[PDB]
Amino acid sequence: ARVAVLISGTGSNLQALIDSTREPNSSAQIDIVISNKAAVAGLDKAERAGIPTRVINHKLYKNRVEFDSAIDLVLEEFSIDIVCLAGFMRILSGPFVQKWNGKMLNIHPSLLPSFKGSNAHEQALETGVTVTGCTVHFVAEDVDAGQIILQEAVPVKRGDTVATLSERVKLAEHKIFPAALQLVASGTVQLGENGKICWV
Structure with a gap:
């Protein structure tokens, strides 16, 4: 499966996806990384991995539909099968x-x-x-x-801030996001006809 990853920030989830999709028995490859914001570190990470990037600045479009259409043009341009939202901040x-x-x-x-x-x-x-x-x-x-598709529980420690809890949860994100992409990219998990999660 050819994969797009959309980002709006640092790109630590992007990074874990890059690393995992390049392990030997992967069913997915990351072919494009799209950001809605310029100068975010997630873009540097993509380029340092040799993956093409595009910035589609959502503020240059009059509404959501038109911004989303610009994104879809790039997805068709790159023949994308699966889209991953990894810290992407637009509904x-x-x-x-x-x-x-x-x-x-x-x-x-x-x-x-x-x-x-x-x-x-x-x-x-x-x-x-x-x-x-x-x-x-x-x-x-x-x-x-x-x-x-997947979930992972993470403890909250006494005296956590948003930052310390956020970092602890990221560590779990970096495990399940790549595992879930692999589930979808292979036969394994799909959205069935009845709108429910189906394990083939």
Whole structure:
């Protein structure tokens, strides 16, 4: 499977995906990395790995549909089978999501359905859980609500900040995101007809 990774930041999830897709029995290859922001370290990481990049600045488009269409043009340009959202910070429109249904994965730093949204660590700390985690899910129109592929629990330590908890959860993300990509890229896991996760 030919894979696109969309990013908006540092790209530590991108990095773990690069490393894993290049291990010997991989069913996936990363052929493009697209950022919606310029000068993010995730772009340098892509280039240092010899992977093409594109910056599609979301602020240059009048609405979501048009920004998403520009992204889709690059995806078709590169003949992409699977899209991975790895720290990508834009909610995608219905038509984009519908087109990419069953072929787009996201990594989210909580155990869904808890702590949906972009500030999950802040929510976890405020709520006082002693256990949080991360989730790889298929992307649905409903934000952070698509079908769950993998999850990994991560403890919250007394006196954690957003930063310390965030780093602990990243360590788990770097394991399940590559394992989940490999599940989809091979036969193994698909979004079935009945809209549910199916293990072939």
